[PDB]
Assembly symmetry: D2
Homo-oligomer: 386 residues x 4
Amino acid sequence: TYAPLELFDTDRLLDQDERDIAATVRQFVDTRLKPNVEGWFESATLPSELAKEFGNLGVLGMHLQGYGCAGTNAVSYGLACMELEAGDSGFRSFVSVQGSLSMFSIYRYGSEEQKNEWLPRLAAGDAIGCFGLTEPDFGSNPAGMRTRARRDGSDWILNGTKMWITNGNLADVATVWAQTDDGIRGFLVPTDTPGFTANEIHRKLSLRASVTSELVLDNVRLPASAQLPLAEGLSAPLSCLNEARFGIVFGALGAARDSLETTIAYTQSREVFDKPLSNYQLTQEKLANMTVELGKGMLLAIHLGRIKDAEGVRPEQISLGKLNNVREAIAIARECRTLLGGSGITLEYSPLRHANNLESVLTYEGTSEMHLLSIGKALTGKAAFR
Amino acid sequence: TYAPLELFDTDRLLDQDERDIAATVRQFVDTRLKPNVEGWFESATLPSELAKEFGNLGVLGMHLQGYGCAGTNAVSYGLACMELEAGDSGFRSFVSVQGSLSMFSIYRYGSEEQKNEWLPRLAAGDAIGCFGLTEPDFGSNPAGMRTRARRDGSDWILNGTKMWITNGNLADVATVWAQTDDGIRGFLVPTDTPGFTANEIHRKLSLRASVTSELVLDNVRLPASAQLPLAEGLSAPLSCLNEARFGIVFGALGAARDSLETTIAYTQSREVFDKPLSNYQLTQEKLANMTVELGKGMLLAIHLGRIKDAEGVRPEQISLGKLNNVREAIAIARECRTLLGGSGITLEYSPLRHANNLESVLTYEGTSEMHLLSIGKALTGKAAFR
Amino acid sequence: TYAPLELFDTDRLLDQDERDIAATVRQFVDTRLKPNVEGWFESATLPSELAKEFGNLGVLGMHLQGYGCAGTNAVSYGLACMELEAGDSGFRSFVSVQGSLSMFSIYRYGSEEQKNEWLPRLAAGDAIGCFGLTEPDFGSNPAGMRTRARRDGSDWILNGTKMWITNGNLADVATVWAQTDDGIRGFLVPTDTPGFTANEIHRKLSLRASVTSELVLDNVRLPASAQLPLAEGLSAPLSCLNEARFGIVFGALGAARDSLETTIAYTQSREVFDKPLSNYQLTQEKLANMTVELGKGMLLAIHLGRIKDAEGVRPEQISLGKLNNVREAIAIARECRTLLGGSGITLEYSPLRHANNLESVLTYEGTSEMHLLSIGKALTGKAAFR
Amino acid sequence: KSTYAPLELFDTDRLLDQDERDIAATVRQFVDTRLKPNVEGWFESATLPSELAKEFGNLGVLGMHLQGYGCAGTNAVSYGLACMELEAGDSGFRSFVSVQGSLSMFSIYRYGSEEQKNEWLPRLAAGDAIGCFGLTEPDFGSNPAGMRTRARRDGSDWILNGTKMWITNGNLADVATVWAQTDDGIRGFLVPTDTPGFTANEIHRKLSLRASVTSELVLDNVRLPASAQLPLAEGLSAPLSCLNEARFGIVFGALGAARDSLETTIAYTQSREVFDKPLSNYQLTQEKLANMTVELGKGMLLAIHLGRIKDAEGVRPEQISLGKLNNVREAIAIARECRTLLGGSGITLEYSPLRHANNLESVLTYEGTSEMHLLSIGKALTGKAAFR
Ligand SMILES: Cc1cc2c(cc1C)N(C[C@H](O)[C@H](O)[C@H](O)COP(=O)(O)OP(=O)(O)OC[C@H]1O[C@@H](n3cnc4c(N)ncnc43)[C@H](O)[C@@H]1O)c1[nH]c(=O)[nH]c(=O)c1N2
Ligand SMILES: Cc1cc2c(cc1C)N(C[C@H](O)[C@H](O)[C@H](O)COP(=O)(O)OP(=O)(O)OC[C@H]1O[C@@H](n3cnc4c(N)ncnc43)[C@H](O)[C@@H]1O)c1[nH]c(=O)[nH]c(=O)c1N2
Ligand SMILES: Cc1cc2c(cc1C)N(C[C@H](O)[C@H](O)[C@H](O)COP(=O)(O)OP(=O)(O)OC[C@H]1O[C@@H](n3cnc4c(N)ncnc43)[C@H](O)[C@@H]1O)c1[nH]c(=O)[nH]c(=O)c1N2
Ligand SMILES: Cc1cc2c(cc1C)N(C[C@H](O)[C@H](O)[C@H](O)COP(=O)(O)OP(=O)(O)OC[C@H]1O[C@@H](n3cnc4c(N)ncnc43)[C@H](O)[C@@H]1O)c1[nH]c(=O)[nH]c(=O)c1N2
């Protein structure tokens, strides 16, 4: 017999170092995270202590060069994301935010002082970052954001609210995007600055094993040096999103794979009408169709990773993978749950948890519809968002 | 503008008393249950005190005659289930179990003594019933059940485990189905009988606002009089399931309607890219497609109810409704959630809760695949379960 | 065993006169049309003499009163359309055009003299009508039409081109819609009028057993009396479309039923791997899913017909049926073909022919997307066509 | 750059070398200049002229992945790209080539004697002779193990009796590879089509693959010498090995029909105005275009992946099933969806989508139905066969 991706033979597309990274992260997930995940999800906690475990593993800022970062290629970051999310999307979300959003914002747009202050600590998981773009009234359309930075002498004064901010209540530093007299700018906000409050969001059905927050900035005063000096316009936060989105292209496949392998095993173990469930045509149809989507998504992820490591990948190319792999992953998790029957309604087997988590992954970092329309613009030359 | 079912004009198919029942139950849901459902779901409880509230409302055993039961037609019972499930599937599940499973088992197969002892209290919600058919190893195939009742003189001794039993930990009496030397039989088990233990199931992601239990029967000794005297073979429990399934055909539509109406209101209020979300083609596509399925399902529910009242409805006819209305309802809830964006991931707006709940509804009272194959058998004359 | 609609028991929703009409038309189709349809499709012909057979049967203008028309209710007209299309969509298309487009245009908007000139012959099939609305450049948006009718004294002169006009080359009289200085108006154009040319369309893959034409109007001069006196604005042609669309709501279900019943019979007779094809789960899944859509569509059609016969049916209500029933019918025809294997690629068994014909039905009388957006506007109050 | 073609957006050309891209371009230009001007008439009239055999032979596509005998000796990825371009023309063009190379020639190349190879392969490669492959019977298609055509020994000679059905090129062929049951199991025979007792009857009134010859073969007391047996073919494995070669071509070919449909339709949406703007400007249109592009590109990545495995250690049947199941069913969905965007104009032979969709009905069914490939994948994942 073959595992779903073994049937496709996606491993032939990876070198030994890449395969070793995947195996290493998978082992970490199996030993350190999997035994605790059901309780973390039920209780709606993801302990701050995991930051150091992820730091020590090497995954925080792993695609970045220097500052104690691993300095891997893009494919390797993707595989790590895939393995984290196979554990739980909350694990991958923590890492997406730390590396591709927080650390990348500083790496790409920061001063030397900012890079030297924060990057080693963030790489080690000794500090935690967050990325405040979305607001209650603006998610898909961040160009409309209302958070505002005004100058007071050489200082800045920030006022606004950000919403749905992963790690907001855990962070030491927030990368906050705000309108200014000269256009959108980014600021590093120490989270102990007076006027800065993070309020944790509870009663989530998705991403319970994750910290998600409202950030309220009430006359937050910062020095001139707090601005990320190179970030100008919406292109700056969007560049960070394109790094994180790349990780999600791989990550969603991990949730899908974990669901599907767990469910194939269940079908072998469960007898219905005196035969294993895996013996019936209806079961095999589902397993085959799900396998076909998972393998196509893995081929697409690796393809995009190879482009990224060569000349770079364009946003509309990332959109192929973000649109496809998240929507096909949530379909796989949901279909798997049907094969588990009653046993599938609890936290015992991963599919329903994965499906719930993937609701957030479908929406964040650009909704399916935003990516759909980005592809449509690339094919036609006509923007149809408005 | 039209509400989805208003566009179909399904009200024209209903008489005044039926429409009044729907309105009465909807007002009860809105006032007594909706203010509390978010907390009930989060904390995984459905208070036992609701038994008396449902009893006083008149919905427990409402389609039965006598014993303080309402004696309504089948369409009215359907509409009540639709309105209860629009609140939450846990509300409708409580009522399905109390009336169509527990009370119906006693009404149809019980002695006069059993009916007089239990039916008035169950109708009033002064006692709670449960129905123990499913076992850890046998759900879709109850013919294979291994709970056993053996004779000891004129007494019976029951041994087995039932699983996924709604209201198990709240019930005063359990209808327990068991194999015997002469075939499947049913027994009324007072829940304080020595050897009978109910263990509540926790860490559910679906039907959290509902009590679901394991029942362990360890040499439970009963008198001859505890047997349901008229129940012989699998036909007896299945007749109860067909009563309950009928209610679910309507119930699932309630969860779908509540999701859809909530979501339409959200799309009218939420502005994206300077216009209400409801203005966009992609939004209207979703709203129209969902409306089309909801109305078709409503026509099918009413059609089946009219058949049931006029002449009885066959199991394979119920299967049309149970297969269709549950799977289309869960699709509607899921698609609604996408339109809500990030706000849809919490308990604030009903779609994600309804989607999760409908995972159980899809599986219980015969999975989609069971109803699919029952329809296949009716069309071809060939059973394809084995 | 049950036929698909027998399992639903849609016959219970009809009276005996209605059921008798369905049976009469089915017998006519089976005896007079079916033995010839494969040759007609292959040769791309539909003999003009069939007009008289349809006329004698009573289906031409059957829902109209007087003028030798049958004067049936709307449900009966729907059932006749269903049975005609079960034969072939080209048969139903002939009847849709003759009755609901041509004759209804004259009946509803025509003068006393026009009605007496044409309605009795059109009802008998001794004359043939057509309906010229669509232009090469304007189909979904007939408000944009450019055929123009101008005055010259009391005469009218029409100039423009109509396209995809069913029966154009066969018609004695054409109802032609044109823009004027005062808005859209309608005209009865005898097809021997100087300047009026019909050119037949060939190399169709859909609706080969049907005549479809280009109409070229080169300054066609008519008397004042040729105007349909009561037709003003786009509402007039659309009212005719709404009559024809209603018949299509039923008609598409006939193509679906014919495909499905033919395919069920094939699966019972075809042995694969030593058992009838109907015995396999994959087969039964398809048969069951297709049955579910066919029956839901039938319930919707009958519901719309009862509304139509009472206070009248609104366009957006018709859109529910036209959107749903055509797109579900083409899916049934296509899925059926897969079950036939190689034998399904020829004209021997109806599915592939039906699927091809339904391509036209999906597009004409308002595309799926037009009906979709019509429903969206009803739900939201916002038009999203532009 | 303001716009990208669907596969340009994926950048699948970066996965191909110059020689491979040159082959695609060469076959595309042949299809555009020689075949496309005639395809509408050929489909309507239900003809595919036999002269095309020599034209395909001269082009180099007949037996292109085979070595020797005047064959091109290309890699498998190049054969795939040629099939993609032929099918973008019409599936009947690709079907001709599938049968000639991967079924007829390959049967002889793999299982034949030296004498058979020398007699037939050079002519077949050149398109100076035409071959066909008779596996399917009226009663047995998805289950060829159940075939009833029989070969019985008469001394040193053979006598064959049976009927084959749905045989591409049957009425044009000079030689038929005919699969038959024997006392010792399934065997293969080269049957010259002028052998007394061998008759080919052409199938008419097709709605799919009208620009292709499809036949019934009837064998009544067909006598053959011992030398007519393919000596190395034993059991169902032999015909299935031929199918696995042809199926690989189809994994690519179906994408050609999809691409041709989709690019034709994107161009139409750019030029067609509805409600005062190009049809391409609307969200509903862009939704369709994007979803179809996503499937086309995923399919192309899968095809190239399978080709690279084939040119390395080799592709297993269940891996080919991934491609055949996926790419054909997604291609037919693309062609159908494209047709909706064309409106009325899409119902004729003018624009390719409806013709492609009809042709793909055959492609979905032949060389193993979607359900056969689905269940082969299921068996690979579970270790349980669910055919019976
Ligand atoms: C758990 C979790 C965690 C995070 C985040 C979300 C969640 C749920 N996000 C926020 C996330 O990026 C945000 O939810 C998405 O951008 C979507 O925006 P809204 O939720 O406002 O939906 P919004 O209101 O924009 O969209 C609602 C619906 O409208 C549709 N739509 C929008 N525009 C349309 C158009 N023009 N045409 C048609 N349809 C259109 C959308 O596709 C969607 O279906 C975030 N943010 C952040 O800054 N930092 C973070 O760390 C995180 N993390
Ligand atoms: C919250 C909740 C509440 C309740 C219940 C469940 C849940 C989740 N049920 C139990 C319920 O009826 C049961 O879950 C279903 O019958 C399905 O059985 P299993 O969960 O054992 O799945 P099972 O293991 O039977 O099926 C697993 C999967 O295999 C598929 N399958 C099964 N047979 C097949 C075949 N022959 N061919 C192909 N596929 C096949 C199924 O469709 C499903 O997808 C119950 N029970 C009870 O007695 N009293 C109660 O009050 C309740 N309430
Ligand atoms: C065989 C046959 C027979 C007939 C007819 C057609 C055919 C094929 N019709 C013509 C028919 O009514 C016409 O084809 C449809 O109205 C669709 O118009 P177009 O073909 O111009 O497509 P058009 O160019 O309008 O539309 C093309 C595509 O764009 C989509 N689209 C259009 N507007 C859009 C928007 N605002 N947003 C998003 N998408 C949009 C459509 O849904 C479609 O998918 C006819 N006519 C007649 O007058 N008399 C007759 O007898 C017949 N009979
Ligand atoms: C135009 C064209 C051209 C060719 C061919 C076909 C056509 C249409 N073929 C024949 C082709 O290979 C054949 O049609 C397929 O193998 C399918 O077999 P049947 O048509 O007998 O369907 P069959 O009767 O086997 O199958 C009918 C349906 O049942 C399903 N089914 C079968 N077994 C099942 C099971 N166990 N469980 C569930 N479902 C099952 C199938 O998937 C299908 O949906 C051929 N042949 C050849 O030898 N040489 C050639 O050149 C060609 N060329």
